[PDB]
Amino acid sequence: EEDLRRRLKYFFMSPCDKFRAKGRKPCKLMLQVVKILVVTVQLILFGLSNQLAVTFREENTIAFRHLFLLGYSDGADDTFAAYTREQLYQAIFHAVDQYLALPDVSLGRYAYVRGGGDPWTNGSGLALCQRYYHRGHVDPANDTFDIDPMVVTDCIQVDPPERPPPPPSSYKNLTLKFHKLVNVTIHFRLKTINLQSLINNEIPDCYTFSVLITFDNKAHSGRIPISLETQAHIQECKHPSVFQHGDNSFRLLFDVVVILTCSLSFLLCARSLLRGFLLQNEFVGFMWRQRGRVISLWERLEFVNGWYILLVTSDVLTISGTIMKIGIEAKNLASYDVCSILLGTSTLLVWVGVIRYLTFFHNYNILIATLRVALPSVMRFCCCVAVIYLGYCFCGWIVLGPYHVKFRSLSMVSECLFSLINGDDMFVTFAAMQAQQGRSSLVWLFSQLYLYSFISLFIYMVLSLFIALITGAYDTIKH
Amino acid sequence: EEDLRRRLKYFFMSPCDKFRAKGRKPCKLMLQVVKILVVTVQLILFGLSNQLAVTFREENTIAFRHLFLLGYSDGADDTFAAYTREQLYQAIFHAVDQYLALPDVSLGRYAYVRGGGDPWTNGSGLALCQRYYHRGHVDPANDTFDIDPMVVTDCIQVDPPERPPPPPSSYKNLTLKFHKLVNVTIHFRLKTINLQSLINNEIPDCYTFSVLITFDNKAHSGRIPISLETQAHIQECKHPSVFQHGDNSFRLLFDVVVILTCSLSFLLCARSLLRGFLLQNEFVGFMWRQRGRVISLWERLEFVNGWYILLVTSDVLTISGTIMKIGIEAKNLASYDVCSILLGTSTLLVWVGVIRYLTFFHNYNILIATLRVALPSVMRFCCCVAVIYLGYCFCGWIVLGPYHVKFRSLSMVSECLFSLINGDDMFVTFAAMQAQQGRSSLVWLFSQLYLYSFISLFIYMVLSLFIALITGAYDTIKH
Amino acid sequence: EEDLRRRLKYFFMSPCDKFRAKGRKPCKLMLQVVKILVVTVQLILFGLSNQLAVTFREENTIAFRHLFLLGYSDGADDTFAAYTREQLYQAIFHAVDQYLALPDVSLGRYAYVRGGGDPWTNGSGLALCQRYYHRGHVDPANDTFDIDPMVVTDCIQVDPPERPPPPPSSYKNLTLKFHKLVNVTIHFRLKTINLQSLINNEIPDCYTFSVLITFDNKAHSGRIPISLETQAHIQECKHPSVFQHGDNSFRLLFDVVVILTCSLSFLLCARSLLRGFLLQNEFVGFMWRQRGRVISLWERLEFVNGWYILLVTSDVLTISGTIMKIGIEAKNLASYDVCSILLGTSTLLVWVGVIRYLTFFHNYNILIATLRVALPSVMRFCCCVAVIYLGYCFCGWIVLGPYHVKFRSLSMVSECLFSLINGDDMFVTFAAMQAQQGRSSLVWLFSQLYLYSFISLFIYMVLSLFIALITGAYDTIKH
Amino acid sequence: EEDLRRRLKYFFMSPCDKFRAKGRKPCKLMLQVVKILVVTVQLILFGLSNQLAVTFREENTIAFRHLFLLGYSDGADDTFAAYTREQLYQAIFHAVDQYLALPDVSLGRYAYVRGGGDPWTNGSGLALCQRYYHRGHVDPANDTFDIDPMVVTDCIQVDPPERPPPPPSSYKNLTLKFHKLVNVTIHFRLKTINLQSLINNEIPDCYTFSVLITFDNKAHSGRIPISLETQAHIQECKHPSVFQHGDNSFRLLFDVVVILTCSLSFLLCARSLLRGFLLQNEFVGFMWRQRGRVISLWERLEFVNGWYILLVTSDVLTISGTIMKIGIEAKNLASYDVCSILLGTSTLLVWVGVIRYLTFFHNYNILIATLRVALPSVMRFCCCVAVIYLGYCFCGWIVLGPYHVKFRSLSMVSECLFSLINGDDMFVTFAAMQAQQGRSSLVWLFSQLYLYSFISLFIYMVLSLFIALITGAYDTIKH
Ligand SMILES: C[C@H]1CC(C)(C)N(C(=O)CN2C(=O)c3ccccc3C2=O)c2ccccc21
Ligand SMILES: C[C@H]1CC(C)(C)N(C(=O)CN2C(=O)c3ccccc3C2=O)c2ccccc21
Numbered sequence A, B, C, D: 001e002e003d004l005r006r007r008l009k010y011f012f013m014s015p016c017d018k019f020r021a022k023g024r025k026p027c028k029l030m031l032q033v034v035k036i037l038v039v040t041v042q043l044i045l046f047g048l049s050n051q052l053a054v055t056f057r058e059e060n061t062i063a064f065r066h067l068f069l070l071g072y073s074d075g076a077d078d079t080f081a082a083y084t085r086e087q088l089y090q091a092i093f094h095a096v097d098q099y100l101a102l103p104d105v106s107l108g109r110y111a112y113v114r115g116g117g118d119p120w121t122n123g124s125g126l127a128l129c130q131r132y133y134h135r136g137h138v139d140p141a142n143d144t145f146d147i148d149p150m151v152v153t154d155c156i157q158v159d160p161p162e163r164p165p166p167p168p169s170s171y172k173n174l175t176l177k178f179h180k181l182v183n184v185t186i187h188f189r190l191k192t193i194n195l196q197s198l199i200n201n202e203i204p205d206c207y208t209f210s211v212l213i214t215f216d217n218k219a220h221s222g223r224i225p226i227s228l229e230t231q232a233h234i235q236e237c238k239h240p241s242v243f244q245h246g247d248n249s250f251r252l253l254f255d256v257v258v259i260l261t262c263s264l265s266f267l268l269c270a271r272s273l274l275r276g277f278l279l280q281n282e283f284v285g286f287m288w289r290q291r292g293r294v295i296s297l298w299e300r301l302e303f304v305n306g307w308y309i310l311l312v313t314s315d316v317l318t319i320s321g322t323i324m325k326i327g328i329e330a331k332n333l334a335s336y337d338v339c340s341i342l343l344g345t346s347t348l349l350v351w352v353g354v355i356r357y358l359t360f361f362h363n364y365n366i367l368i369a370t371l372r373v374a375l376p377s378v379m380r381f382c383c384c385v386a387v388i389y390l391g392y393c394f395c396g397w398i399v400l401g402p403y404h405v406k407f408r409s410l411s412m413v414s415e416c417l418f419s420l421i422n423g424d425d426m427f428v429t430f431a432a433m434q435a436q437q438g439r440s441s442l443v444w445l446f447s448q449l450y451l452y453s454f455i456s457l458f459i460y461m462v463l464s465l466f467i468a469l470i471t472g473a474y475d476t477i478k479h
C-alpha cells in the first residue's frame, strides 16, 4: 500500500526486527518471561499449603475409618459391607462405642459438637438414623405385602460425657426392622485444630469434619455397603502473634508483585488490542482506494492475533487466582480446589506463552502452525469419529456397565474407550468378561464383538487417518 | 441419458440440492435426528432398570458367598478351596448351618422352597449330593483298584423349620469317601422380593435364586475349589396399585413413540428401497439402446446404497427391542441381556447414522469413504495376518495354556494376542513365565521365542502394512 | 530359452494355470488343506490330556503348600519367610506333623515311599537335612570367627506308621545352630494315582511327586524364604481293561492318519525338491549356449523355493510329534513339554502354510513379499539397534537389578526393555524407583536418565526408522 | 588439493580401505572388540558382588520390619500406621521388646552397639525419642492454646543385657502427650557379619545397620505412619586367610587387564586426536591458496569425530570404575551405587561403540546418520513440546497431586505424563479420579479436561510431528 504500509507491516514483524527498526525498548518482552517464573513459584508456594489441607482432610478420613468401622483395613473401601444381622449391629455399635470413647482411644484431638442442625436435637452430638419404610409386610411365599415409599426417620440422639462429670444407654435397645430397612446413617461432626500448618506458619486452621457413616441398603441384596464420608469446614479460632512476623509480609508481598506483573502485562496487551481496533477502522485501505479484489470481510474477523486473547485469558485466571489466594490464606475464604484450578490453568496457559516467544529462524512456526492448517480437517474428521464413539459409549454403558467394573458410568466408559484406542487396560476389559463366560454368554459374546470392533476400528482404521491428517498437514506446511 | 437422466441424477444428489430442486419438505431428515434422541433416552431409561436387575442378582450372589462359604472374603473367587478333610467338612456344614439359620442371621429376606424338582424329594429344600465313584479301591502302593466312571448320587435332603413349630440331624452323620469323591454339590433355592425396584416404581419383582455350592474335585489334586453360582427366576406375586399411576402410562407412551418413529422411518426407507427396484427395471437404459460398453451386471449389485440397509437393520433391533422392553417391563417376559444387546446395537448403529447425514462441503466423505477404498486391500491383507494369528493362537493355547493364566482358552489367547499387538499386559505375559524358568525350561524358552516373534512380527512387520494400507487409501482418496 | 523354457516356466507358474496346462490332478493341494485340519485337531486332542497333566501336577503342588507350610495362603509365593526362631521351628515341625498325619488330614490320596535314594537311609521317608557350616564362630563385636565353606549335612530320617501297627520322636530334639545355618531342606516323595484322566479314559497315570521344602538361608539376612517345589514321575501300575475299548483304537487311528498325511505331503515335497536338483544340472542352459550376461552363480543359491523347506521342517515336527504322542499316551514315555512344543510349532508353521496357498489375483504376494524386500534393510538396521539394546540390557541388569523387581535377570531386562519400546509397565518401572528416591538417590537419578533415554530413543527415534523401512518397502513393492 | 589431499582423504576413509592402502596393521580395531567383552564380563563380575550387598541390606531391612513393627506383613509399607493410643503404645513397646529379646528370637546374628553418637548417652543402645512441642494447650472448643514450634527431645535410653549377667524398666513409664506430639523416633544400630559373601570368597563384610523406626505425626491427622529405614556401614573385622588364595589374584589380574585395554585404547585415541590438531594447523589449506569460499571457521569445529570423543568419555568411566572396584573389593572403599553407574554407563557407551565399527557397504550409516540430520529439527520441535509439557507438569503437580497417587511429586508427574504419551496407566489415572467424583467435583471435572487434552494433544497432534520429523529425515537421507 501507499501510506500506511509501514504501520501495516510493522505490526506483524517479529520483536527483534520490530525493535531494530523503530519504537521503544522491549519491556513487554521481559515481563512475560518474569511472569512465567513469578506465577510458577506462586503456584508451587500455594501448592505447599494446598496439599497440606488435602492430606489433613484425607488422613483424618482414613483415621475415622479405622476408628468407626469394625474390621476395615486400608484396602477395600468398596467391598466393605455387613452380611449378618449381629455383625451389622456390631458395626453400628462400634461406631457409637468409638464415638463415646474417642478422646481416650484417638491419637489426634477431636472436640465434639452440640446439635445446631436438623439431624440433631438441642444437645445431641452423635445421631444414628434409620431410614425405613412406613408401610411394609414383605414375605416372598404368602400374599399381600403393601409397601409405599415413605421413609420414616427413627433418629436416636446421643452426646458424650466430658472429662469432668457433673454431679447434677438408649441406643443399646436399637432394632432395625431389616425387611423394611432402607439404610442406617450415623452423623456426627468433629472439630479439630490443624497443627500441620506450621511449615508456612499459619496456625489458625480450625477444622470441623462432618462424618457420615452410611449403612446403605438401597439394594436389599443381603449386603449393606458400609462407608464413611467427611465434609470439612474451616475458619480461625483466636490466636494472633507467636512466630508469624515475616511470612505474613513476604507472601503478601509476593502475590501483589504477581498482581503487578499480570496487570502490567494485561495493560500492555490492552495497548496491543488498542492497535487492533485502528486497523479495522482502515478497512483494508478502502480496497487500496481501487475497489480491487472484492474482499468479503470475513478474514477481517480472523485478522486479529489470538495469542494475546489467550494471554489475557491466562492473566484473568492468574489475577483471580492471587486474590483467591490472598483471601484463602489471610482471610475468611475457604476453597483450595477453585484457586488450584485457577492458578494451575493460569500457569498451564502462561507456560505455553513461551511458544509465542518462539518465532526465531522462521522454523519453529513451521512445526507449530501445522496444527492451524490441520485443525480445519481434524475438526471435520473428529465429528464422524466422535459420532461412532458415542455409539459405543452409550451402548457399552447400558449393556456392559451392569456386568462390569469399567463401564459403570458414561464417564468411565469415555475413559475406558479412550484408554482402549491407545491401548491400556485392553486385556483387563476382556478379562472382566471371563466371569461372564458362564453367565449371560450372549453379553460375553456381544462384548467380544464390541471390544474387538471398537478398538480394531479406532486403533487401526480411524487413528491412521488422524495420523495421516497431522502428517499430511506437515507435508503441506514444509513447502 | 435422454429421458430418465433427471430421475437418475436426482436420486444420488445430496438432500440440500435435492430439496432445492424438486419434491417435498425434508420430513425424513428430522425424524432420523429425532430417532437418535428418542432411542438413546429409551436406551438409558431401559438401562436404569437393567442394572437394577444385575446389581440385585450379583449382590445377592456376593451375600450368599459370605453366608454359605466358611472363610471367603471379597477377593479370591478362584483360589478358594479346601485342603483338609475336617476343613472341607466345616465348609460343607457351614453352608447347611447357615441355610438352617438363614432368617436369623441374614440382612435381606429369603424364603425357602419345597422340593418340586429332581435333586429334591417331595418336601426337601437343601440337598447336598455326593457325586462319588460306584467302583473304587485306589491305593498307589499295592495292586488292584478297579475303577469305572459310574457316579452314584448320595443326596441328603433337609428342609428348615418355620417360626411357628408344629407339635405333630442326618447330615451330621455325613461321610464323603474322599478317595472315591468326584464332588459335593449343595443345591438350594431362595425366593426373594426385589424392593430395589421403587426408583422406576415396579415393585413386582419376585425373584427365586438357585444357589449351587460346588465342592469340585474333578482333579483329585488334594485341593477342592469351593464356588457358589446363582440362577435367577423372576415373575410377579400379587400387589396391584399403591403408587404406580403415572410411570405405567409414561414409559408405555414413550416406547410406542419410539415404535412410531422407527416405523415411520422404516416406511420412508421402504419408499427409498421402492425407488431402488425401478432403476433395476431400467437395466442401465438397455445399454443406452446402443449395446455400448459391454456392461457385466456385477456393479449393478453394488449400485444400491447400503446405509438404508444398515438403517433398516438398526430399526429392526430398535422395534424388536421396544416390544421386548414393553414385555419385560409390563407382562411376564424376563431376559434383560437380549433387550440390552438389541437396543444397544440399535443405538450403536443409529448413532453412526449421523455419518450418513454428514455429506456437507464434499469433504467428510473424503475422510469416511477411504475405508470403502481400503476394505478391498484390508480384507485381502487381513486373511494372511489372521492365518498367522491362528497359528500363534492354536499354538499358545495348548502349549502355554497349561502353564499360564492368560492362555487357558482360545478366547483368552485371542484376547491376549490382540492386546499384545497394541501393547497391554505385554510384560505380564513374560512375567507369567518367571515361575516356569525353574520348571519346564523348554516351555519357558519356547514362550520367549513365541512372544518375541509374535509381537515383533505384528507390532512392527505387519501393523506397518495395515497403517500403510489405510494411509495409502488416504493418499489415493485425496486426489 | 529354446528347448527347456516350457519346463523352466511351468515349474514357477501358479497351481491353477499349472493344472490348466499339463500334468495331473491337484492331489498335493488338498492334502495340505487336510493337513491343517488334521494336525490342529490332533494338537487340541493332545492338549486335552496335556493340561490334565499340568493341572494335576500344579494343583497337587498348591495342595502341598497348604499342608506343609504354616500360614501360607494362595498369594505370596515369594515374600513367604520365617523371621523368628520358634516360628521357623514351627514351620519345620508343621511340615513333619502334616507329613506324619497326611492320610488323616488330606483330601486326595498320597502313598509314602521307602528310602531308595541318597538323601534317605534304607527305610526312611521324610528326611529334613540341615546344611550348616563345619567351622564357624561368628560374633560381630569380638575377634576371631574362623569360617570355611564346608557344608555338613545333618539329616534326620523319619517314616510314618501305616493303619495297622505291628506289635513287633527324634526330630523334636532338633537344633539348627542358626549362626552357622546355610539352610534346612525337607525332602519327601508322595506316590499318587491320577484319577483326573478318565475324560480321555487312560486311568494308568501313577505319579510320584518329589516335595522339596526349602528353608533357604543363603543370605543370612534374618529372613529365610520358605518354598515348596515338586518334581513329578509317571508310569503305569497294573490295571488293564475296564472301559477303554474305543479310545485306544480311535486315538491310535487318528495319529497314524496324521503320520500318513504328513508322510504323503513329505513325499510329494521330496518330489518337488527332486525337480530342484535337475535345474541345477542345466546350469542356466549353459548361459543359453551363448556365454551371455556373465552370471555369477549366487542367485542360483536363492533360486530354490523355501516354502517347501519350511513345509518339510514343519512336517518333521508333526511326525516327530505324533510318535512322541503315541509313546507318551500309549507307552512308557513321559515328556508333555517337548511334544507340545513340537506339535505346537508344527501347527504354527503348518497354519502359515496357507499363505503359500494364497497367491491369487497377484495381490496377496504384493503385501506378503514386502518383508522379503525389507528383510535386507531390517537385518542391517536391527544390528545397530540391538547393539544399543544390549548396552541398556547389560547396564540395567547390574545397576537396577539389585534395587528393583523387573531387572533381576537379563531375561527380565530383555522382557522389560522390549515391553517398554511398545509401552507396557512403563509407569511401573518408574514407580519401582519411588522407593529408591530416599536411598541411593544416584541410582534413582541414574535410572530416570536410563529409562527416559532408552524409551525416548527407541519409541521415537528408532521405531520410526523401522516403521519407515517396512512402509518404505511397501512404497517400493506396489510399483 | 595439491600436496596434503592424500593425508586429508586418508584420514576419513574406512578402516578396510585405509588398511589396504598404507599404514600399519589394525591393532586398534581388535582392542575395541576385546574391550567390549572385557568390560562386560567385568561389569557382570562386579554385578555378582553388587546385588549381594543390596540383597543383604534390603532383606535385613525386611527382617527388621517383621521384628520391630507389630502387625506388619510384606505388603503395605505405606498404609501402615497407628490409629489408637494403646495400639501405638504396643507398636512402640513391641520394637523395644524385640530389641531387648533380639538374639533369642532372630534368625540372623545382630550384635548391639554402645552409645558413641549424639542420640545416645555413654552406654545406651536403643533410644526412643519423643519430638514434642515445648508450648501447647490445644482444645478446639475453648480459647487460648499458645503453640510455638520448639521441639523438645525426650529421649529414653536403654541397652540390653548380654548372655553373662554381671553380679555387680524406665520405658514402661513412657507417656507421649499426643496433642503435643510431633513424632516418636526409635534409633538403634545393629552390627552384623555378612556371610553371604562366600560365592566370590570375600568374607570380611562386617556391616552396621542403623535402624530408624519413625512414628511420623507431622500431620496430626489421627494417623501416625510407622516406618523403618536402615543405613548400612561396612568395613573388615579381622580374618585373613582361610580359602582366599586364587580369587584375590584372579579378580586383581582381570581389572588390571581392563585398565590395560582401556588405557591402550585411550592412548590410540590420544593419537587419533593428535591428528586432529594438525589439520587445524593447515587452516583449510589456506583457502586452497585461492582465498575462495570466504570460509567462516565454524565447520572447522565440527570436523573431529564424535564417536572417538564418546569412546574416550566411556574409557574414563571404565578406568575410574575399575579403580573404584579394586578399592571397594580389596580395600576400605564402600560405594557400590557409584561404581555400578560408572561401569554400567561405561558398558552402555562401549556397546554403542560397535555402531562406530558398523560402516560397511555404506548402508548402516544411512540408517544411523538420519538422527544427525533430524536432531536440528528435533531439538527445535522438542523445545515447544517441552514448554507445553512443563505447563501440564507444573499444573498437574499442585492441582492433582493433593488428591491423587501418581502426581505427588514433579518427578512422578514427569513419569506419569511421559507414560501417558505412549499409553501406560492411562486408564488408572482416570480411575484415581473416581474417588474424587463425589468430593471436589471441580477437581474431577478439571482432571478430565486435563488428562484428555494432554494425551489427545501429545499422542495424536504432537507425536505425529515427531514421527514425521524422523521419517522425514529418513526421506531425505536415502536420496
Ligand atoms: C481424543 C480426540 C481425538 C479423536 C478425534 C481421536 N477423538 C475420538 O476418537 C473420540 N472421543 C470422543 O468422542 C471423546 C469425548 C470426550 C473425551 C474423549 C473423547 C474421544 O477420544 C475425539 C473426539 C472428540 C473430542 C476429542 C477427540
Ligand atoms: C483386528 C483386525 C485387524 C487385523 C488384520 C490386524 N487382524 C489381526 O491381526 C489378527 N486377528 C485375528 O485373526 C482375530 C480374530 C478374532 C478377534 C481379533 C483378531 C485379530 O486381531 C484381524 C484379523 C481378523 C479380523 C479382524 C482383524
Ligand SMILES: C[C@H]1CC(C)(C)N(C(=O)CN2C(=O)c3ccccc3C2=O)c2ccccc21
Pocket (backbone or CB within 6 Å): B452, B456, B460, C381, C382, C385, C386, C387, C389, C390, C414, C418, C466
Ligand atoms: C524386536 C525386533 C525388532 C527390533 C529391531 C526393534 N529389535 C530391538 O529393538 C532390540 N531387541 C533386542 O536386541 C532383542 C533381543 C531378544 C529379544 C528381543 C529384542 C529386542 O526388541 C530387535 C533386535 C534383535 C532381534 C529382534 C528385534
Ligand SMILES: C[C@H]1CC(C)(C)N(C(=O)CN2C(=O)c3ccccc3C2=O)c2ccccc21
Pocket (backbone or CB within 6 Å): C452, C456, C460, D381, D382, D385, D386, D387, D389, D390, D414, D418, D466
Ligand atoms: C521424550 C523426548 C521427546 C519429546 C520431544 C516427545 N519430549 C516431550 O514430549 C516432553 N518431555 C519433557 O519435557 C520431559 C522432561 C523430562 C523427562 C521426559 C520428558 C518428556 O517426554 C521431550 C522433551 C524434553 C526432553 C526429551 C523429550
